[PDB]
Design a protein around this nucleic acid. Sequence first.
RNA 1: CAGCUUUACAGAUCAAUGGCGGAGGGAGGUCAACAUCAAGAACUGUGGGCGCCUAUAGAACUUAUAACGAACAUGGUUCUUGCCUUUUACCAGAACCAUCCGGGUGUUGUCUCCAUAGAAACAGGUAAAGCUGUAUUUUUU
Lengths: 75, 241, 82, 69, 660, 80
Amino acid sequence: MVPPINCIFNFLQQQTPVTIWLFEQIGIRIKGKIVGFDEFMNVVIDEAVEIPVNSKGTPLGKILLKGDNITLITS
Amino acid sequence: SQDDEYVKDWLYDSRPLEEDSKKVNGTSYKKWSFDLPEMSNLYRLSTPLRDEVTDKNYYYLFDKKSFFNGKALNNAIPGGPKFEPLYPREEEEDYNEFNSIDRVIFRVPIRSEYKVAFPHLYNSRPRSVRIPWYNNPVSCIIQNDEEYDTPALFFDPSLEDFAPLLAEEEELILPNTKDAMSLYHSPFPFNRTKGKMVRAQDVALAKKWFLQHPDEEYPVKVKVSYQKLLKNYVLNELHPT
Amino acid sequence: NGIPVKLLNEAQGHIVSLELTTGATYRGKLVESEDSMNVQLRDVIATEPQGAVTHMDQIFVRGSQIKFIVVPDLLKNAPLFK
Amino acid sequence: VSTPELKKYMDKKILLNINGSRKVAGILRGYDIFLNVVLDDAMEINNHQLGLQTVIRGNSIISLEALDA
Amino acid sequence: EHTIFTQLKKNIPKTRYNRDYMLSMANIPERIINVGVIGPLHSGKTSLMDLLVIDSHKRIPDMSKNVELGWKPLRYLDNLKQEIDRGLSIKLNGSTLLCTDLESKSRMINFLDAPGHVNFMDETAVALAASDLVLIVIDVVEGVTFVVEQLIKQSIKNNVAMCFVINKLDRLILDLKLPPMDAYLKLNHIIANINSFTKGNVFSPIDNNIIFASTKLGFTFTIKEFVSYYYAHSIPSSKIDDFTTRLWGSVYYHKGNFRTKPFENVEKYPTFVEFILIPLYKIFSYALSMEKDKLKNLLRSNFRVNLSQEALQYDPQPFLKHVLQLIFRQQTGLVDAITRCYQPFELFDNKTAHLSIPGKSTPEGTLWAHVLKTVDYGGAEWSLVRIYSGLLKRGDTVRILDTSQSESRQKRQLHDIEDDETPSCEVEEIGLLGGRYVYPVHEAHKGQIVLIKGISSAYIKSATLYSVKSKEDMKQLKFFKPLDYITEAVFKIVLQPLLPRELPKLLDALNKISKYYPGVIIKVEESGEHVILGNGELYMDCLLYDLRASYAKIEIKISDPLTVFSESCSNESFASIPVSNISVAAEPMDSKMIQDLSRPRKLSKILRTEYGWDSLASRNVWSFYNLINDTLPDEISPELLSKYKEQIIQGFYWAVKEGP
Amino acid sequence: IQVAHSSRLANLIDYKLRVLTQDGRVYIGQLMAFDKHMNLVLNECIEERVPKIKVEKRVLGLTILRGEQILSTVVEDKPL
RNA sequence: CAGCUUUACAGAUCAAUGGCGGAGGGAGGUCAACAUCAAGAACUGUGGGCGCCUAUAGAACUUAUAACGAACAUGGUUCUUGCCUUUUACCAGAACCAUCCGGGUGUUGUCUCCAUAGAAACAGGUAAAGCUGUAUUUUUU
Ligand SMILES: Nc1nc2c(ncn2[C@@H]2O[C@H](COP(=O)(O)OP(=O)(O)OP(=O)(O)O)[C@@H](O)[C@H]2O)c(=O)[nH]1
């Protein structure tokens, strides 16, 4: 078995490309690299980029995305 | 005053327990309920007469059932009683091929002890034979030197703002509890602490002794007497009026 | 402990029905539940708000997104109540 | 308190039905008490793949229908 | 009327749960547990069963006043006159009880209280076969005897969930008068012993497999149950499991809010002793000894339980029992433990395989059911059958096969790999063995046991009944092997009827005995002398009683108890002697090898090699039964006369049966 | 509609209760059991749904209604 | 330290509804009369379905090494025995039977010894007894 926390830790260690989907919001996504870790799914993510979904790119700085509104993580 | 503290006041009264008390029904004197310590005292007193074996397994082949079986099979358990046989021994085998000494083997002597224990097996053509008991062993140790919860006769094994239940008890074993324990394992009369009253007639203090296996190194006459008593008992038991 | 949860647990085995917040009704053999109503079912149909049915083998469902769970009338009779 | 009993669904391909009428696919790798799924990545419902390995949050899950029996 | 008895009418003991619900539950598998409770002699399995029954039911007619009070045990399931009068549970007369767990939800449970005594181990075996979990009840005092070990081994062999019941704590509390610490130590020792006898699975009171019982005094409890009852008020929901885990394994309280694995100097005893055993002891002593009012007050405070005004005036032992009942609530803890033990239902398949052969599952295609034991439950013959798959309806036409004709059938099937329905019967009436009453039912579903009336007359002992609808289905099906009644029988009692006039009657009686008592070989010899090869003395006696009273009522002669002897050879055969109107050698096998035997040609050869390190040619030739038969001349490999030797081997079997 | 002046929800057990929900549906049924988190067990439940005109009716039976989705509970009628 | 249910409390409007209501004894007698206590493990009614099923219920007592007795006598009858030779009076076993010395349970009725109130809950307090409680993903932040 591989827990979610463990996975998160691994991702952090890596510093590989991550693409986050927002909760209750289909049209917008985020794409960055995981820097932080918390007890909840909340993580700080430098080099983030906002993406409008194909139903391309937009300018965006360094961000911490809150745990409550996460959907997807991948790295 | 020390040992027999409770019983002494009433023990030797005409009506063994007083009228107008909470320990008996009343002046009709039909029912009684006792406290523990008094009961314990009584038990202690009665050591001579109530001398009974707390081990139930002791009565192996001295059961009423066993006696009945013996009677049926005309087979004395040597200690116990003997009767006229139920059935006349019709010795009419006629040297048949069954039960012959040509045929069978005699490793075991097939004692009549074994007959009343497995009547339907070892005895052939059993009639009116009741079924006997077949029991567990009784590891029950009572301390005679005035001590409390001790592995004496046997051997040891090889190897958030709260407390456990019944906290503030401060003592596992209450001062009366050894006595209580003793009472617990004892037989019918004292086991209980409430009862219906029997007539003085209807108590039997001799009975118990004769039911027991007789104490060894007694004379022959005594043994005979015991046997007779047993027979008397057994017959009474058998034919229920 | 939650009595509805207990009831749900009891219903384990039976052909239960199950609607979500989305409004998509399921109906099938209940497999397993937890303190939070983490239901599982077997041999289960699935109808959307439109009405188009879709059959499926093994479904797991999360209690938060579950709206209400229909049990058969047999468990009305006994025995966890009193 | 109790762990989600998803040991039957371990190493099987599951259609995770998620919030906003969306769907995810993939083989099941791991899980925890909050129902955060860990699964090897697959296509989002014609169809197109994103990511190698994926970790889905518990709150987002509407359902998870087993593709493999 | 009758002397050997059941209820005989529909004024049955009414039940606290409604029976309809139970029936409904029985429809669906996964919500049925066949328990089959087992142990040694007088461990108290029957007592436990009785207690369970009492818990289930409202007001039972058979239970007198005395029994209710506590005094006499209600031995419920020993309903037979014999099993009463004798004191032994002799036959399988279990129960079907809707039993709740710690999780309030409830499940139907087919208990089977086997005999403890070691000559009815056939019965025990049968129970094991029936049942999917097995409660191994053990006398605390006697501990893990060899018998217990044997039972455990048997359970392991025929794949079953072993949920232990360490019974008769009363004996250590009061009879022995062990100190609480001493008692705890004893318990630990027992547990260790159990573990040792077990192959792998570690049993302890944590995990809820060991169950601490005192079935006379009328309480069973797993520590979990205890915790639930009495350590919820204090300890919050998060650490309750943790607390439970802590309790047993040599940890202490440290006079402080969290526990520690080291020994502490101020406090004396471990957590189990402090949080359970000690409490129990206190309860006991107080019940026996303490001022009643004080005790009542304590109950009100600590356990949150009130003594009735009537229950205060009780006699000591009865009072104690009552108190225990009040404390340790109606036995759900045990049920919970059982459930926990049998949370894996993957074992079921394994068990089935063991019973029959490595099976391909075909549930919807056909109904099939292991007829286990015939019984004379309510005077009339019923058959204790476990429906394994399908549903067995009343008045269904059903094919049956005695396990005698199982191996042969299998062989035939293999060979095959026309409809040859050899026998069959109609199901007269299905019922649930509910101890003293048979509550009747129309259906009977997968994974549950039931009494069926029509089957009995087909087979002798242990049948497989099935209702197919196809050739493919038939092919798929398998046939349960004969029950290995662990105790082999070598107590040879020879009969003759005393009046030859009524030989038919005697024969009938014998047949009945064979049907009912499974651990009973009945050889009808050439000399007109019937022979019964019973298991032991007591068992034999019981059988005789049954025959010579209930299933015949005949005057019957009986031999001295002999044994089945068996011929063998010490040295090897010296003379190569042929026979005419064949020459075969003789030599004993290896002792170890023999033992192994007691407990594909290439594969066989390999096995042989592993066992004794014999020659390969010998292995190749070998083909044994019952012992060993080779075909090891020179010309047999060239010759076709020696080839095809099944018929030849049949002949040998006769020889094996009846030696020189 | 008539009903006694009740104090708590637990005291009005087995009364015929109307139950309003966030989606718009109205579940009518007798309250068999309650929860700390307002989950209700309903005896002979009937779902009344109002689409965007007139009350569409659906008979259910024994139902376990979760507390999250409930808006409020009105007493429709007495027991029996 | 919250909540609801009950007593002990004023003064209420006193509807509303419950519950204690034709609201009135208790303890006991070596006191009665009756009933009933060995039968399909066995109880009694109630309607309904039509001598039997299905719901209602009730149930005091006695029972599983089977009994009202943790107790034990004696008769009568046959059959077999034994001392015996006549019988009674006896021996000891069997089968039926009875008698007796006792036992409960229930209902009345009495006898004795102690005693005496015909109305209280609601709005909620005052005080005390029964149980429950101690916002970051699945309930209410
Ligand atoms: N001290 C004590 N005695 C018990 C306990 N449980 C049963 N007994 C007694 O010991 C014996 C065991 O009870 P039974 O139920 O007869 O035993 P069993 O389990 O039927 O044994 P089998 O006949 O072999 O099945 C009985 O004589 C009971 O009175 C117990 O927990 N403590």
